[PDB]
User: Fold this.
Amino acid sequence: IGRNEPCPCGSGKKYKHCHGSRVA
Amino acid sequence: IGRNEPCPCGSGKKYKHCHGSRVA
Amino acid sequence: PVLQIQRIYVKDVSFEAPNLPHIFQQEWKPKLGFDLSTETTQVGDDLYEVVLNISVETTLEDSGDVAFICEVKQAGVFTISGLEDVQMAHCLTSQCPNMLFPYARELVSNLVNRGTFPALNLSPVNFDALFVEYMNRQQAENAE
Amino acid sequence: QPVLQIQRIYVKDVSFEAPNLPHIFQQEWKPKLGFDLSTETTQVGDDLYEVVLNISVETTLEDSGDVAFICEVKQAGVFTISGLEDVQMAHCLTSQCPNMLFPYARELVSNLVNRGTFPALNLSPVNFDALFVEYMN
Amino acid sequence: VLQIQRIYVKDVSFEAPNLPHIFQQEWKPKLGFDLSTETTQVGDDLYEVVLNISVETTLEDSGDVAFICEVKQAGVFTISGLEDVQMAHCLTSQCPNMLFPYARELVSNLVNRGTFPALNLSPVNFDALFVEYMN
Amino acid sequence: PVLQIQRIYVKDVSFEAPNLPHIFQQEWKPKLGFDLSTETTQVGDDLYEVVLNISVETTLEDSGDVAFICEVKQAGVFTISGLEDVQMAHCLTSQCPNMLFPYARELVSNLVNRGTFPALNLSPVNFDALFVEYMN
Ligand SMILES: [Zn+2]
Ligand SMILES: [Zn+2]
Assistant:
């Protein structure tokens, strides 16, 4: 699942800006 | 006197490749 | 008989550095994660689009924090013809991907520099080895 | 005496997508450009602020509606700013700084588009003062 | 009236003579920065403003040149409806100021290519070059 | 047997657009001149600096005026060891230059775009072929 892919949760957010974020 | 400018001395070389070189 | 490169382009690019600017306060002890794969698609008569997928993730070890993650889909359209099944498989999983690597390398390099992280120049990859994996995985599927 | 110094310029996030390749290359290049922009600031230290310039670009081909490419850039910079009155500082964070960051973002967008072998796209100059007048209200 | 018609580079030069060995020296940089502008009318109400920037960095404990970068960043502007003084400020301060950030990014870009630590030119007060003009 | 990239950097760069802005009024009928060459230098034990030299000149046919001239000296330092004279010759004149080409290509395209000229992305160079011209 690519960082740019649509987050698997219909947020419309990209995987990396939703469930895939790594911020800390 | 610009780096890409023809060197003052009809070398043909860009000033930076003639009288403007900084090759230590 | 013929292998020609028609066009080299990027299909997808992604670069993220979530922990900036504070991450630059940590000790630069990088741990590099590198993922790679290729895929082909016939796009015309003797026209094939080969795509090189590269994923790179760097984290600092004495913290686990992600410095940056970079995903790239480098592609090229090739004109290929006059090759036996195996010769063709080697061309699509080794030869072509190998021509595209240096372009992906420079792309990764360029993006990492934009985040002001120390240079990252992907080490050469031996695709012949990936070609062997393809074969072996096929001798496994065709044998069911 | 007021001070405005550039500490670091970096990219926090980049995205470029070209969904319909290589077939989109067969359509007539009649581009329709969608351009979104915004900025946001965050104090990251004493007199240290991180200004972020967000630029979103989408280009579609008119006689088909197909997406040629989407490009989103989050260009940022850490600046040392001090000695400004509330209004002065607001202008500096919503106009001055974003303006210094723009050309960087512009070059990143052009760089990525060229990598998708699309004809050059050099974002036109942005008058950030328009974005200041809006912020004040 | 003041409109930007086109922004382009007329001349660019980046040189790092002492590579790769210079990377072994202690990075104790000494920055030399030169700047100047010049205008030329290229049409009716059309002026080409050129920002000239020269940057030279040497390492102090050796004097060796790390890199030299020269840029000629320009733009074509449509300018009209200004008294002699207001026009002078526009050509020697306003316009050069619009062009600076583009030149900044160019220098920054080239420096990066040489893998030297980032160099982001500090903002320049162009009103100063306007005063110098008047005088 | 080894081949590692230590550093990739530019030693010299030049871009010139003499006839601006008027050249923008001529019909864009480009004539491209492209020159290339490489050179190597041992810079240490198993350390070699490979330099890719790219020269590019574009003129407009209907007048001969020069649109732009771009010269790039792209280089890289590589750790190379464990190769026979021929193998090494191929690695220094083909393998390494090939790794550097896309960097130089990007720099040329980057500078050309700064001059607001239509995109110029140098076509792939088969260095294995420029290796043959070396054995001769
Ligand atoms: Zn989600
Ligand atoms: Zn001379």
Q: What stands out?
A: Helices of chain C lie at 85-114, 127-141. Chain C has two helices and four strands. The two ends of chain C are 34 Å apart (CA to CA). The first strand of chain C starts at residue 2 and ends at 16.
